[PDB]
Amino acid sequence: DVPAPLTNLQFKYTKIFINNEWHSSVSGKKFPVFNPATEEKLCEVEEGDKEDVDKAVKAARQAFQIGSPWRTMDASERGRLLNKLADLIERDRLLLATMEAMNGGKLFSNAYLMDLGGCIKTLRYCAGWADKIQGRTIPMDGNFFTYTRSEPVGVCGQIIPWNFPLLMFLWKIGPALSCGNTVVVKPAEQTPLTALHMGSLIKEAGFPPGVVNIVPGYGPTAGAAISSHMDVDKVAFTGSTEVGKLIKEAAGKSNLKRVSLELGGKSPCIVFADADLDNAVEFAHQGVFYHQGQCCIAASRLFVEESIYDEFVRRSVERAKKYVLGNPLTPGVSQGPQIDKEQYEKILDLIESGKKEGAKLECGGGPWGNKGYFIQPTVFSDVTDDMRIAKEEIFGPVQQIMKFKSLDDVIKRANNTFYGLSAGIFTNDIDKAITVSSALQSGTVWVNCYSVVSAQCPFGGFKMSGNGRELGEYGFHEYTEVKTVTIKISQKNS
Amino acid sequence: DVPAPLTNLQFKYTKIFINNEWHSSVSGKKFPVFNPATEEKLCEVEEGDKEDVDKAVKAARQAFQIGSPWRTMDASERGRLLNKLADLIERDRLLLATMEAMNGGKLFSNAYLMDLGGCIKTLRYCAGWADKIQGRTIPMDGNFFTYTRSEPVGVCGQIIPWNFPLLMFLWKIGPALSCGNTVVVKPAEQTPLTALHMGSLIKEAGFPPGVVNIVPGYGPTAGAAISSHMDVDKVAFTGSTEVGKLIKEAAGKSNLKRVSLELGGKSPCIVFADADLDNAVEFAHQGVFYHQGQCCIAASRLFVEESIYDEFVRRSVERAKKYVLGNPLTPGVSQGPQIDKEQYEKILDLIESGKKEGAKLECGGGPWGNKGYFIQPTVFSDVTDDMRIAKEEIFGPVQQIMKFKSLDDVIKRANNTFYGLSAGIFTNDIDKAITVSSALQSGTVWVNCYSVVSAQCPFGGFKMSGNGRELGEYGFHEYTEVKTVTIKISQKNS
Amino acid sequence: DVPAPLTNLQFKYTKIFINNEWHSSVSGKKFPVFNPATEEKLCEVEEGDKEDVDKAVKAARQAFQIGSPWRTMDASERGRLLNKLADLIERDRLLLATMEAMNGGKLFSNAYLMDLGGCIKTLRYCAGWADKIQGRTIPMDGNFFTYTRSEPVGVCGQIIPWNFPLLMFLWKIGPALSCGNTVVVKPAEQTPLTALHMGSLIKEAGFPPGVVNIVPGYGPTAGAAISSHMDVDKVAFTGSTEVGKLIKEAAGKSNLKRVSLELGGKSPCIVFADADLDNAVEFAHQGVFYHQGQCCIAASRLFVEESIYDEFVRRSVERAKKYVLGNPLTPGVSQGPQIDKEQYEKILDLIESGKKEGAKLECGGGPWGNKGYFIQPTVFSDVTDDMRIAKEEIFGPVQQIMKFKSLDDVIKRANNTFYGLSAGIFTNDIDKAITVSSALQSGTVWVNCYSVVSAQCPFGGFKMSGNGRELGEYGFHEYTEVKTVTIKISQKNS
Amino acid sequence: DVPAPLTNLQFKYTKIFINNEWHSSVSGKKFPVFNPATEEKLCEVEEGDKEDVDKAVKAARQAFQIGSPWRTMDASERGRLLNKLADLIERDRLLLATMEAMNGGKLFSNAYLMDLGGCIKTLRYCAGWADKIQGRTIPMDGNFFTYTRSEPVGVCGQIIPWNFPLLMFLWKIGPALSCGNTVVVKPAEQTPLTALHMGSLIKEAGFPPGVVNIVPGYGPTAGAAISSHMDVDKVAFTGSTEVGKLIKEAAGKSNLKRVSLELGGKSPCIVFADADLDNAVEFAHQGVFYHQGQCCIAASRLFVEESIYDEFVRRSVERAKKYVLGNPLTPGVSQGPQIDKEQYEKILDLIESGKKEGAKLECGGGPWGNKGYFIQPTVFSDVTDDMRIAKEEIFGPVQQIMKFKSLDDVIKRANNTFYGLSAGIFTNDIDKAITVSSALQSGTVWVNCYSVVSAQCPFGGFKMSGNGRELGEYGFHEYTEVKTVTIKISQKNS
Ligand SMILES: NC(=O)c1ccc[n+]([C@@H]2O[C@H](COP(=O)([O-])OP(=O)(O)OC[C@H]3O[C@@H](n4cnc5c(N)ncnc54)[C@H](O)[C@@H]3O)[C@@H](O)[C@H]2O)c1
Ligand SMILES: *C[C@@H]1CN(C(=O)CCCCC)c2cc(O)c3ccccc3c21
Ligand SMILES: [Mg+2]
Ligand SMILES: [Mg+2]
Ligand SMILES: [Mg+2]
Ligand SMILES: [Mg+2]
């Protein structure tokens, strides 16, 4: 039961958020934000750059000083504040979902049910960890009492993408704040608006000034000012593998800030002949087509065992033709646009390369309409490993179906990539489920399912799909810096 | 390479061990110890009773005093000492395996390979935990610094059975000493000898006097003096359910000592029609017949799905006929005797009740030989839930085979017992493996195997099969007592 | 800022709570509940006995069946429900606090601020753990995949006292429910009313029927029916050491249910000559006098170093005379009554024994008024270790002040008791704070403070003050039963 | 019992170690290795470069393949192998200590007692973790079974310095192998020899070929080939800040390899007026002067409260005059040389800058001897924060003494650096010990001691002193890569 979206949405929060106040850009420049389904301008936003990032970093640093309200507050109160923030998101759920759909080209009921649901659940999970992040007491050698503190890391710069704008925002700030950090967040230039609304809710919830700062603007300006900043203790980034390398490099060049990255993928989904086919087809399909193919974890290499290949192809093609393209706020639309022209063209070019290189176009395979960035859902069969569409992250509604016969071969092929974010396996065989999931070089492996992401699980990549984990117990701990304290005593006892 | 067993074994360690010295019993009484295969007396051992336990408890208490060598030693030195002990057991393996086989009625190659191997591995595992048992620092409300210590509990009384005498001995002392406790061990009256040899090695390894004390003797005398003792901080018991109840009652009446129990079982082994049959037959067979059926975890209700039941029965019966009974030191013998007359008679009485209640006797069914307590390997089929042989722990070489046709039924029947020590499930279906293992009320559930016990895993019962877990990470934490220390400070910071 | 208490409170929930419904006692009997400050009857409550407990246990067992709503619900939803319950407590805070003050003889603003605040904080802490209770994956020997499940224990019987009725109620149900158990709760006969109100809020929050059942009634009837019940998996108890022994015994005799206990104390508070005296006097004072001396953790042996003894006595006596006795709902009253006549007389008798045995009565020392169970706040000096008032838990407003000179002596004297719940030390010396807190045989040790209890910390006794811990990470885990699952695989890899 | 050092040492292991075999460099070049006390050449070693690193990386990759001996071995056997290696180091202790002292300029009794002792203890600690590294099972939302594996990361390049060559070698390989990784080690060009001896012992202990590979050689050649390598999964580096930046940059540019760094320091040691002076003088003195000042953690800003500053200076100066410089193998020598010319000259240049900037030269201040790189022990007083000797890591026997009078000031001054490796605080005040240790931005804070480093504790820097922790529980988790496995099931139960 999903309400009707708001239609005549008026914008309010369009400025830089520092110390719980709204500021104009130091330059005075602004940049436009668009609806990808219509190409209309939604509003303009202050364009943050280096000098705005520097103010935000100062604010975050002051809020993190020993003795400050955020440092001396009970851990349990950090938790309380995070739950209050989630209450405010629930109150503003329609507004946020509409806003997210409009700005992001995202199907409204998905934005309402999945994105917003995920935002709330994430924050609630995080809230619960605040007073449960613990250090140790250690029975070291000699007459000493030794303990550790799990302290916050400090000022954390957080740079995020356009595909799940609000959700990614909360994935970053929730764990950081739960652990006691302060943050400077740089939303994607395509999708600042829901993040800016969150600023108003952070203030309303009662967070002290300087605890969250938000600086909308471009990557090589505001983004790079964060990655290179001499007083940012940690940078966390989600985005393209290419900018990820630049972030790590900049961290090295500047102050050796801690780095965490999630960079997208080319995730294999392997379907063995004993799999439940109905289950497998639907999961594989959603796994590559969700949000117009704009998921990091997209099942973009679908390996199907020979004896079921033709049938799986047939069913996949049938499934891919059940969409109605158009405005994602409009009742009955089941596929939205891609986010912007750069992505649209990237994807068309890759689609052309699959045609040129001999893959079999089964459906779709070109643009749709004459307004907004729409691409027809496309399936290719007889794809081979050396094709661009088998190698490169497409980030559009383009499914690749490939054949295998040997178990050892499909594992080596699945693993033969610099990516490692996720993978899926479909089989009813216990032994294969365990051993194949052990052998895949992927951060998450799903078994008889795909795209199952929950706040209780750590999430992130092997190899060039990432450094570190987000969420679960394991993620939390990476927003802490360990301090060992060792005290000389006259006599130690067990 | 299993070497030849020693033959002409001379006994040396036959006394009460306290403060690293050997003592006569206070009464001067001794009790005889027998070889169950031949009924000949091996030697006499000092008969420990209440007054000897009191001496052992004072020794253990003194060794536990704040400022003693054992309390002030580095945790890592506790670990070194445990590893040194394991070296000594390695050195003395042939002698201990021989002794264990003679005293216990145990197949000599099994004593040498399984029991002794397990002793060594258990101690090595324990040794590694010693300086890794850690407390916490805790972000509690208010201007306080709080931490916890994982202290040893103190003086632990440890009462053990006759079926794996040396391995049980090490299962008790290893974790206890790892965590810094002192102990008073009470070996079974049937099988004190390898434990007494262990005293010599504990001394040789260099443990401080009073850290391990061993009081051979009977149950209602020495055992009960431990369970009722007003200065024992914890009792750990492995044995019968009946006596476990007495121990727990004694603890309640005396000084509320902490209690952990492992009490045996009536463990179900469920073989689904989709299972690998060769694998299931062998594991289920070893699962009930191992060590003349004298395993707490014996797979003594074998539920087999109707479509494969007859075949499974036929194959189990054929497998059960491949034994040579005799002296467990003699090459080619593959089944030894039961431990003693009382067990022998309990088993024959239960075999008799199966015949009387209408079970189908497939093979075996009575004694063998003219010396020592031997029973033919016995298989009953068409067993039903209401039969004594389906409800009571038999603890001899007696297999019950029953059938089932519904998943829900067989879970409910498996669970319908006051026991809950272990269970097995044989299937190739992923869903059944996870969901049935979740639904079984048993401490250890094996899938496509049985009797896989390892030091890294916690082991113990649901329901009346026990309280607490032994070994693994979890075991070690039940040999500690948690102390919270909360220190007022002028101002807390995260 | 505390509101005025309700004055004309009408009672509504007076029945047995089973399956989210209100039931008459099977017998039809009822028992009266009184205001201890006035001796007026508040109302009558259904008198639960064995047959009511049996219905409650059946309900709890059915709610815990595999497939039931409570077993299949997301862990995160158990958390959500617990936070909703805390929201309802906040909504009903005035009502509950008034009710608690009236029924319990508790100072209203303490009930409002401390008890109710604690109730809410406790539940919020618990809620946060629900989806963070995790098992393990274990790299055991051999070709196996091994994991553990932290499953709930089952049906947990929970028996509680009259001193902090609502708070103790939530201490029990919060962690149990967070971990997925079902419960049968037996409030104290003196103080059922706030617990019964909680039943209405549990239903209103949405908990499934049978998840919490509440059976008001007496100890040797309803209490003993729980401790002896053959289908209760665990009993948790707070109360007198005497009934604790009976609970453990009954657990042993019946079904070996798991036992956890918190049993009160004789806690030492040690004040060294370098202590801040202002701080120390006020903490020691509150530490023994809070809630009319009716805290388990009462600082009822106050050891003061010789050179400051006379001054500490003087200041303590002055502090003890600053009370206004009377009705705990009345503005300006700072000391309420004791809970009932049995306690009142226990305390008077102990006060008489201190007079008889030669302690120096410094103030108070007898009853007050002629209605309700009021005792004048009493301080004794020159108390010695062999006096009844130095040995026995008094549970009334009676402070014992004792002298020491030697550090080693005061430690041995502090430790010379069967009790071990808590202790305090006041010193500015780092070395003493660490080493003395290590040497004290007490579950919680406070340093330069006293009575600091928070949900993030495990809480419970050494020796005869308890078995197990409540709250913190450590408590949570004791409402779980560990299951190890070991799966045979073709080949294991690290 | 420190034995006499060997004199007439013959070298045997001088080559590149790959797959348990010794190789010439691919170029055929060798490089000379010197004794810094005498400047004489010890031997020549094969000069490893990019092509030799490529060979080592292929070997390590192959040894890491799914199904290899190293991947399929029981975790507990990894532990056994580590303990066996520690046995071999024990056997070869005199030879290794002699070698370490000759090659490193290190006091022979310190090499034998401290360095070698530490090597052995570090490996024993690591050995015990191997089969105790565990993942999780996770109660995630929905009908799923989720678990995590703590897998090894893979191929780890490990680049180490000249100051504790063998101990650093074991600090790197111990945890890495414990967790199941394979490695490529690059010892410092000044000090390859004990590491090459270790290759022989790795082979003798029985590790599979390719599990450890060692490539002696220079930094910008072999080191850089590791940090840039497209098939190394993680680089771990201990050394200068400057080079740490290069490594992190190289990782970003190449394959986003995981990076951990320990980079040295400018560690403050704060002595309050209430401290025990005798204790503080000695710890602060050893804290800066140990191993000719060549410790990352050197207490190189000594802040002393004004009321005791002059006395502290006087006593420090007297202590600094009790050295005999010479060959560190000669009985009675208590200070050896600096490692090499470049370090020697860096130190003299810094000493010079102290004189020029107005520090008060109390003793020492220039070179000594006519052979080897010796510098007089030097103490400067009246040092101020802006001086080169207060800002830069000197890494020679040079003590800076400064004064302070306010707690707030001294914390701010201690923290005002880009380093954050360690700090010490000397005080007897409980409040200061906890609160100042909390406020210091340093990885290890010692209280009333200094330089207490133990295998059970995590060790590493805040800020530009490092990324990540080594050793303790926490260290071991950075040699793992977390994989989440999520399996669809028909119905989940708690
Ligand atoms: N630890 C504590 O917080 C605590 C609380 C109350 C009392 N006490 C101590 O105990 C003394 C006596 O108080 P009490 O008589 O009110 O406490 P108690 O131990 O009798 O009662 C505690 C709870 O146990 C129940 N109970 C009583 N008898 C039982 C039995 N035979 N089987 C099962 N349950 C039973 C009661 O009905 C109540 O719910 C007090 O003076 C005090 O010293 C300690
Ligand atoms: C009874 C004991 C004391 N207490 C306090 O809050 C005293 C504080 C007084 C100074 C303002 C307290 C609190 C909680 O939460 C408890 C829980 C369980 C057992 C005992 C207590 C106490
Ligand atoms: Mg880009
Ligand atoms: Mg018996
Ligand atoms: Mg009573
Ligand atoms: Mg250099």
Side-chain angles (χ1 to χ4, degrees), chain B residues 136 141 248 256-258 437-438 440 443 445 447 458 461 463 466-467 469 473 481-484 486 488, chain C residues 136 248 256-258 437-438 440 443 445 447 458 461 463 466-467 469 473 481-484 486 488:
Chain B
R136 295 296 180 267
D141 285 0
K248 196 185 254 255
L256 295 163
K257 63 175 61 54
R258 292 82 178 109
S437 64
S438 289
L440 291 176
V445 185
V447 179
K463 296 191 262 185
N467 291 175
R469 291 296 172 265
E473 186 193 348
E481 191 73 43
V482 171
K483 172 181 290 167
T484 300
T486 289
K488 189 181 181 280
Chain C
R136 300 290 186 257
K248 197 184 268 253
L256 293 159
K257 54 173 64 58
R258 290 82 178 105
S437 64
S438 302
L440 293 174
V445 181
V447 182
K463 299 190 254 178
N467 290 171
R469 298 288 179 271
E473 177 179 29
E481 189 73 44
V482 177
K483 168 176 292 160
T484 295
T486 289
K488 177 180 189 299

Side-chain angles (χ1 to χ4, degrees), chain C residues 296-373:
Chain C
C296 46
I297 55 164
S300 53
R301 297 181 289 149
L302 173 58
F303 294 94
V304 181
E305 205 174 348
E306 256 189 32
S307 73
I308 55 169
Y309 174 89
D310 295 332
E311 190 189 359
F312 208 99
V313 174
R314 286 199 294 283
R315 292 163 75 157
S316 298
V317 174
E318 181 170 56
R319 179 66 178 82
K321 294 174 164 176
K322 290 174 190 191
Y323 285 94
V324 171
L325 277 63
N327 193 311
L329 294 184
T330 298
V333 162
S334 52
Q335 182 188 324
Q338 313 307 134
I339 188 67
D340 63 19
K341 191 189 182 60
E342 184 191 308
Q343 292 306 300
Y344 173 86
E345 293 177 4
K346 188 186 129 176
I347 297 160
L348 291 178
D349 179 70
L350 276 161
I351 284 174
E352 289 308 299
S353 81
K355 288 181 194 161
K356 290 188 206 140
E357 286 183 341
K360 182 164 191 222
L361 175 79
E362 303 277 348
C363 65
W368 179 96
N370 186 52
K371 180 197 61 171
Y373 309 105

Side-chain angles (χ1 to χ4, degrees), chain B residues 61 65-66 71 121 134-136 138-141 144 146-152 230 233 241 244-246 248-259 261 263 279 283 418 433-434 436-449 452-454 456-469 473-474 477 481-488, chain C residues 61 65-66 71 121 134-136 138-141 144 146-152 230-231 233 241 244-246 248-249 251-259 261 263 279 283 418 433-434 436-449 452-454 456-469 473-474 477 481-488:
Chain B
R61 177 56 62 199
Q65 292 314 282
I66 285 294
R71 286 296 294 279
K121 288 178 183 277
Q134 302 182 144
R136 295 296 180 267
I138 303 182
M140 74 152 290
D141 285 0
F144 304 96
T146 293
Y147 65 86
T148 67
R149 300 177 17 98
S150 278
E151 305 198 342
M230 292 297 295
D233 301 294
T241 292
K245 298 164 61 140
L246 299 184
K248 196 185 254 255
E249 294 162 37
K253 286 205 291 266
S254 54
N255 72 339
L256 295 163
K257 63 175 61 54
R258 292 82 178 109
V259 171
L261 302 177
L263 304 173
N279 185 63
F283 271 117
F418 279 105
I434 305 160
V436 178
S437 64
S438 289
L440 291 176
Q441 293 161 23
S442 301
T444 295
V445 185
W446 291 288
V447 179
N448 291 335
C449 58
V452 188
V453 176
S454 208
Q456 299 79 19
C457 309
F459 180 92
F462 281 41
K463 296 191 262 185
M464 302 186 70
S465 285
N467 291 175
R469 291 296 172 265
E473 186 193 348
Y474 285 108
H477 300 291
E481 191 73 43
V482 171
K483 172 181 290 167
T484 300
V485 179
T486 289
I487 307 190
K488 189 181 181 280
Chain C
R61 175 59 62 207
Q65 294 311 293
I66 284 293
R71 288 300 292 285
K121 280 180 190 266
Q134 292 177 155
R136 300 290 186 257
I138 304 182
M140 70 158 301
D141 287 354
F144 306 92
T146 295
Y147 65 87
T148 70
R149 296 176 28 89
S150 293
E151 301 191 349
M230 288 306 286
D231 203 34
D233 303 297
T241 290
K245 295 175 87 190
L246 301 179
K248 197 184 268 253
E249 295 170 54
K253 266 182 272 191
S254 52
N255 71 339
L256 293 159
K257 54 173 64 58
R258 290 82 178 105
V259 171
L261 312 163
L263 311 175
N279 186 61
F283 271 118
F418 276 106
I434 297 166
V436 178
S437 64
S438 302
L440 293 174
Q441 299 158 348
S442 292
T444 302
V445 181
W446 294 287
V447 182
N448 292 329
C449 57
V452 182
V453 183
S454 199
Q456 300 76 26
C457 307
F459 177 99
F462 277 41
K463 299 190 254 178
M464 298 189 76
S465 285
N467 290 171
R469 298 288 179 271
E473 177 179 29
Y474 289 122
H477 294 83
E481 189 73 44
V482 177
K483 168 176 292 160
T484 295
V485 185
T486 289
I487 308 189
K488 177 180 189 299

